[PDB]
Structure 1
Amino acid sequence: SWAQSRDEQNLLQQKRIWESPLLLAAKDNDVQALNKLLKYEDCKVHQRGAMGETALHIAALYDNLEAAMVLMEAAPELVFEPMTSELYEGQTALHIAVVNQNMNLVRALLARRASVSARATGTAFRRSPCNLIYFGEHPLSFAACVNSEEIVRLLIEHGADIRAQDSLGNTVLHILILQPNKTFACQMYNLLLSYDRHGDHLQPLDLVPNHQGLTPFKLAGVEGNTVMFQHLMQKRKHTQWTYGPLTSTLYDLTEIDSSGDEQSLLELIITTKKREARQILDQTPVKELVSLKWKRYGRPYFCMLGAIYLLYIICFTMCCIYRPLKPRTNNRTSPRDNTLLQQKLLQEAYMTPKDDIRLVGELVTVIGAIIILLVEVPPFHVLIITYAFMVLVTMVMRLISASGEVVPMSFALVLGWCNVMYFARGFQMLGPFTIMIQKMIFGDLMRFCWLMAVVILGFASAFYIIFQTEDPEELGHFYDYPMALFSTFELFLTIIDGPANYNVDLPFMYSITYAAFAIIATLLMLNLLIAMMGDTHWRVAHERDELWRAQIVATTVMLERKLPRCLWPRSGICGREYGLGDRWFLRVEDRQD
């Protein structure tokens, strides 16, 4: 109940102006009421609303230019009056008359010398999901957003700095990018670059970052405004000769490419949670870049590392299928027909020099897992890191030489095999299946296991209690409750044969209850989940190529953060050899229509 208090600071506003006949006279443009109310009797000009309202802010608010013209003579200084607090801080009526598309009161307030650099630093202006909008601080940004061109030009004519920033360090161009209207603000980007005229030696205003280092180009890459991004790419390209339908162009590639820890554009496209920024991957300077960076120097390094990983796993399992494992020379099977096991896993028998090869490849696994961890001292990181935890757990478990060492070999074995599926993404037409695993587990099954838990607890708890009476020597599916859940689980997935003896009678309730489980769960809840996975598969299969491209990009970015130079040059042509400067361009050709 947070913004309710906001409304409590709003409706009080709707009370106060309602009970102030000055400001109720500022509601409606009753000039005669302003003359008798204002020019005749003495009235203070300092009547403050719920959060800083003046009657000049009210007539400014409710479209009353004629009332504000009466308010000029009674208030030369409420032109300079901001709003007090907690929603609107530093906002004056200049911002207000700017906002409502015009008033021509901009002529009146700049005629009374309004502060063009007034920062509306209130709560409701700041970037928030609770706020429905984000216009910045300065009214130049406000008129910039609402597409009031001659008003903006009039604001440059009154010396408003285009280079002014907000609390977030954003320039007015950064504010233009954050607007959801895209081509409706692109012409403002065309206009304000003409007002770069006094070229600052720091930047010509197009390379100015925010507090988090976002140049507006890279901001447009982060925000995924493709319409904006293409138009800024019109600036970046430098076309060469055209040959009929052929056209040689030369993209700039400075902020796009990785540089000397520039934290490149592509990195911020991957690391953002914004889904639609990956449409920037569909751009032809982008897609060609990652295409070239994959088809050479990315793909053979990836497949070579994956082959080395294959030799690591085969090197692992081979020294893992051979284990010391004496005969059970120790104690006899004390529970009858229960402890069927005979191996007990030898203590320090490091003899039999076949086991020396086991020792060598075992040390290969230990050292390789140490290499994995030294990579990872700073969704598939967790498989390899926790896998390496399991390798060290079974390693120390062998050095202490304790008993229960089958479980870390088990965990590390299923993780060690399944972790090679990360390498399937560099093998196009097998790439997006890992994403299909991701959505079928985390997107569907994790929000469906909470439903199946009901049923498995139901019939597990049923069949245990029904078979509390029975001899577990016949149909030992449910002799114990924690394994009754297990048998019930396997019956749910249609794995077990289905318990039936035919030699003795069943309990009579079991025939009903097993039919009930047979209907509601075997065909019914199961095939629904199958249909969910089927919708998932077609849904991913629709856009699997772009998703594969995202796999390639994330693979490349992850590769560059873990690989030095001298074998990875930065791609694209170099400058400086052809008079092109330090910028590393790239050329590409395209036949037309």
Structure 2
Amino acid sequence: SWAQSRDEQNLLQQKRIWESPLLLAAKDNDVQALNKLLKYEDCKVHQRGAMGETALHIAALYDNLEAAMVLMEAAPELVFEPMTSELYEGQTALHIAVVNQNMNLVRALLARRASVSARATGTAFRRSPCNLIYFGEHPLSFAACVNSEEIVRLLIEHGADIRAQDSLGNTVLHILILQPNKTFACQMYNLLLSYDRHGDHLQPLDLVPNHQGLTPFKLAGVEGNTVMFQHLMQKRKHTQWTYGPLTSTLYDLTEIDSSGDEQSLLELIITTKKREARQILDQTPVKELVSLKWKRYGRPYFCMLGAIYLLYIICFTMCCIYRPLKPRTNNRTSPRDNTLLQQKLLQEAYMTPKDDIRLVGELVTVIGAIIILLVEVPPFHVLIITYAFMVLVTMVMRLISASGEVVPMSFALVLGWCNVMAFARGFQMLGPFTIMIQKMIFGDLMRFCWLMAVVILGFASAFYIIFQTEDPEELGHFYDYPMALFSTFELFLTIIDGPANYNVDLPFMYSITYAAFAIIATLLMLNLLIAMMGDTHWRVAHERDELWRAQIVATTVMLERKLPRCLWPRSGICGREYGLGDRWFLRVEDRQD
């Protein structure tokens, strides 16, 4: 809707230039038409367009070098003119001549003393999926993005401050990484770091964060610009001796796995929604860390948590398959050939001190339940926190001592068991299968359960109307509509045997309909779900160890934020005694090929 308002504003600008004789003469450089229009008669030069145009902006935008030469004699001060409002705010013609790769008015605007500190604070320049581009505010940032090297160099030779920022806090190095051209923009990164002359006594342009606190090295990791990222590692690495085909290189390891303000590089690789930024994990200075971090101190510290969780659920259940549950001494003959039960769940009979051992084993879960919430005072926490509710619920179900106690118990038990699926990630060749289950359910099945619920609410609603006629004493598959859904559900998954009596005849509309149910659902709708399962399985295993590797890291940093020090040293060997400084290093070796 706003883009239409961008388009409604845009054509109004075209109708505006169509009516003004100056700006329509500013479309094409008809200089003989201009000098009759400009030099002879007295025309105002502040003819504003639909959003703040001048003729000086138009000839700069439609590549009229020669027409703007006439404009410089007539307009000495329209260089000092920003574009006005609502898409272009603070844009001048110094920006515009840069965007069209040159004009040599570029040289003439500075010969008329243009302002290179002009900030393009418009909406149509701000970072958005609405704009198809993003180049910041300053024309120096407009210079570096379009890959025009000498045009950049001219701005250095007129005082364009490299250390400028946008509203987002992004400097000119941050804009170069955000461009979709990756190799084509990498050469500017070397040229613009040739002009980092002083550094302003701290962070010499390569460590300056934005408003959200992002160095361009880490932001390169966030966007996953892999080609740029290898080029920034060339600066970071500091090679030691080389031994023929061997190279004892030494990566720097400074912003990777800190405990800083954003706590890592690695979590920022995880917590973005950009799927493609996880390609960095195959790159060797990061790939070596997460293998070393997981091999020693990662994997056995995980399984030591994993061994505790198995003994927890076995204990639970041991205190959940043994339940008090007297024989039925209460109200007897309420099930008149009807809802059967005889246990009724003992009130406070906590005698027989085998039950005191059970009372010990019950308290093992309860104390362990509080620990999980003492962890989680702030896709698998949603298992274990909902595990932590139901253990607390089933004790409140015992302190109040109500009746409906199995209904939180069954949520508690199977999610307690199915949460050790999460522990199968640290047992390699079992990792991404848990990723596969998440890919089936929230990726394919929940956008397919809307298809199965259509069919199943037809036939179950159908069969209730067919078997409204019959005595459900024979053929009790559809005695009522609530279980009719459940009864059709496993005919749909080929479990219930198919309702057939053979003592009496069936009604005639049943035989057609349940046969039509068989064709449309038993072989067809079921197997088309299986091919969706069979499609995504081949999608995962073709990228297997990748999503295994992404599983390890996000597990690892999550383990670090909830485990203290003095049991975990920060990986990579230290400095200051081997004599480089507080930067902590790790080395890696390679053959040439």
Q: TM-score, normalised by structure 2?
A: 0.99
> Structure 2, unaligned stretches of length 5 or more?
none
Deviation of 1:338 after TM superposition, in Å, equals 1.2
SS in 2 for 1:184: coil
* Counterparts in 2 of 1:388 and 1:337: CA distance versus 1, 3 Å: same
Deviation of 1:334 after TM superposition, in Å, equals 1.5
Native 8 Å contact 2:246 2:592 kept in 1:
yes
Q: Deviations for 1:289-342, whole angstroms, at most 9, x for unmatched residues?
A: 010000011111100100100000001001100000100011113232212211
Question: Is 1:528 the equivalent of 2:561?
Answer: no
Deviation of 1:260 after TM superposition, in Å, equals 4.7
Structure 2 distance, partners of 1:400, 1:133, is 62
**Structure 1 stretch displaced more, 332-341 or 489-498:** 332-341
Amino-acid identity (%): 100
Native 8 Å contact 2:492 2:521 kept in 1:
yes
Question: Is 1:36 the equivalent of 2:36?
Answer: yes
Q: Deviations for 1:82-133, whole angstroms, at most 9, x for unmatched residues?
A: 1110010110001000100100001110000000000011110000100000
1:158 alignment counterpart: 158
Q: Count residues in correspondence.
A: 593
* Counterparts in 2 of 1:380 and 1:13: CA distance versus 1, 3 Å: same
Native 8 Å contact 2:61 2:96 kept in 1:
yes
* Counterparts in 2 of 1:262 and 1:271: CA distance versus 1, 3 Å: closer
Structure 2 distance, partners of 1:92, 1:346, is 83
Q: Deviations for 1:120-166, whole angstroms, at most 9, x for unmatched residues?
A: 11110000100000010000110110011001000010000000000
Structure 1 distance, partners of 2:113, 2:451, is 67
SS in 2 for 1:415: helix
SS in 1 for 2:120: coil
Deviation of 1:259 after TM superposition, in Å, equals 2.9
Deviation of 1:495 after TM superposition, in Å, equals 0.4
Native 8 Å contact 2:246 2:590 kept in 1:
yes
Native 8 Å contact 1:246 1:591 kept in 2:
yes
**Structure 1 stretch displaced more, 252-261 or 501-510:** 252-261
Deviation of 1:399 after TM superposition, in Å, equals 1.1
Structure 2 distance, partners of 1:335, 1:295, is 61
Q: Deviations for 1:447-492, whole angstroms, at most 9, x for unmatched residues?
A: 0000111110000011000000000001100000010111011111
SS in 2 for 1:250: strand
Q: TM-score, normalised by structure 1?
A: 0.99
Structure 2 distance, partners of 1:331, 1:80, is 94
Structure 2 distance, partners of 1:177, 1:78, is 33
Q: Deviations for 1:482-531, whole angstroms, at most 9, x for unmatched residues?
A: 10111011111010010101110000110000100011000010000000
Q: Deviations for 1:236-281, whole angstroms, at most 9, x for unmatched residues?
A: 1111111110110010000012235552110100110011110011
Q: Deviations for 1:149-201, whole angstroms, at most 9, x for unmatched residues?
A: 00100001000000000010000000111101011111100001110112321
Deviation of 1:408 after TM superposition, in Å, equals 1.1
Native 8 Å contact 2:257 2:263 kept in 1:
no
Question: Is 1:368 the equivalent of 2:368?
Answer: yes
Q: Deviations for 1:405-451, whole angstroms, at most 9, x for unmatched residues?
A: 01111110010000100100001100000011001111011000001
* Counterparts in 2 of 1:533 and 1:398: CA distance versus 1, 3 Å: same
1:202 alignment counterpart: 202
Structure 1 distance, partners of 2:181, 2:583, is 32
Structure 1 distance, partners of 2:370, 2:261, is 27
Q: Deviations for 1:4-41, whole angstroms, at most 9, x for unmatched residues?
A: 11111100110011111100000011001110001000
Native 8 Å contact 1:90 1:121 kept in 2:
yes
Q: Deviations for 1:193-238, whole angstroms, at most 9, x for unmatched residues?
A: 1101123212111100100000000000000000010000000111
Native 8 Å contact 2:125 2:137 kept in 1:
yes
Question: Is 1:432 the equivalent of 2:432?
Answer: yes
Structure 2 distance, partners of 1:215, 1:260, is 12
Native 8 Å contact 1:333 1:339 kept in 2:
no
Native 8 Å contact 1:575 1:584 kept in 2:
yes
Q: Deviations for 1:323-377, whole angstroms, at most 9, x for unmatched residues?
A: 0010001111323221221100000000011101111010000000100001001
Q: Deviations for 1:370-404, whole angstroms, at most 9, x for unmatched residues?
A: 00001001110011001110000001101111101
Structure 2 distance, partners of 1:4, 1:538, is 42
Native 8 Å contact 1:574 1:583 kept in 2:
yes
Structure 1 distance, partners of 2:201, 2:499, is 84
SS in 2 for 1:319: coil
Native 8 Å contact 2:366 2:392 kept in 1:
yes
Native 8 Å contact 1:251 1:586 kept in 2:
yes
SS in 2 for 1:464: helix
Native 8 Å contact 2:431 2:548 kept in 1:
yes
**Structure 1 stretch displaced more, 252-261 or 105-114:** 252-261
Structure 2 distance, partners of 1:543, 1:31, is 62
Structure 2 distance, partners of 1:337, 1:217, is 74
Structure 2 distance, partners of 1:60, 1:36, is 21
Structure 2 distance, partners of 1:174, 1:261, is 19
SS in 1 for 2:185: helix
**Structure 1 stretch displaced more, 326-335 or 456-465:** 326-335
Structure 1 distance, partners of 2:61, 2:140, is 18
Structure 1 distance, partners of 2:493, 2:241, is 65
Structure 1 distance, partners of 2:553, 2:2, is 41
**Structure 1 stretch displaced more, 195-204 or 121-130:** 195-204
* Counterparts in 2 of 1:265 and 1:481: CA distance versus 1, 3 Å: same
Q: What's the Cα RMSD here?
A: 0.7
Native 8 Å contact 1:22 1:55 kept in 2:
yes
> Structure 1, unaligned stretches of length 5 or more?
none
Structure 1 distance, partners of 2:198, 2:246, is 39
Question: Is 1:347 the equivalent of 2:347?
Answer: yes
Native 8 Å contact 1:224 1:276 kept in 2:
yes
Structure 1 distance, partners of 2:592, 2:337, is 80
**Structure 1 stretch displaced more, 161-170 or 335-344:** 335-344
SS in 2 for 1:386: helix
Deviation of 1:573 after TM superposition, in Å, equals 0.8
SS in 2 for 1:124: helix
Native 8 Å contact 1:223 1:277 kept in 2:
yes
Structure 1 distance, partners of 2:353, 2:241, is 71
Structure 2 distance, partners of 1:539, 1:128, is 31
SS in 1 for 2:254: coil
Structure 2 distance, partners of 1:260, 1:314, is 40
SS in 1 for 2:588: strand
Native 8 Å contact 2:250 2:585 kept in 1:
yes
Structure 2 distance, partners of 1:441, 1:133, is 36
Native 8 Å contact 1:120 1:137 kept in 2:
yes
SS in 2 for 1:217: helix
Structure 1 distance, partners of 2:192, 2:151, is 13
Q: Deviations for 1:43-90, whole angstroms, at most 9, x for unmatched residues?
A: 001000111110000011111010000000100100111111001011
* Counterparts in 2 of 1:283 and 1:302: CA distance versus 1, 3 Å: same
2:584 alignment counterpart: 584
Q: Post-superposition, which runs of at least 4 consecutive aligned residues in structure 1 deviate over 6 A? A: none
Structure 2 distance, partners of 1:448, 1:567, is 46
* Counterparts in 2 of 1:260 and 1:69: CA distance versus 1, 3 Å: closer
SS in 1 for 2:516: helix
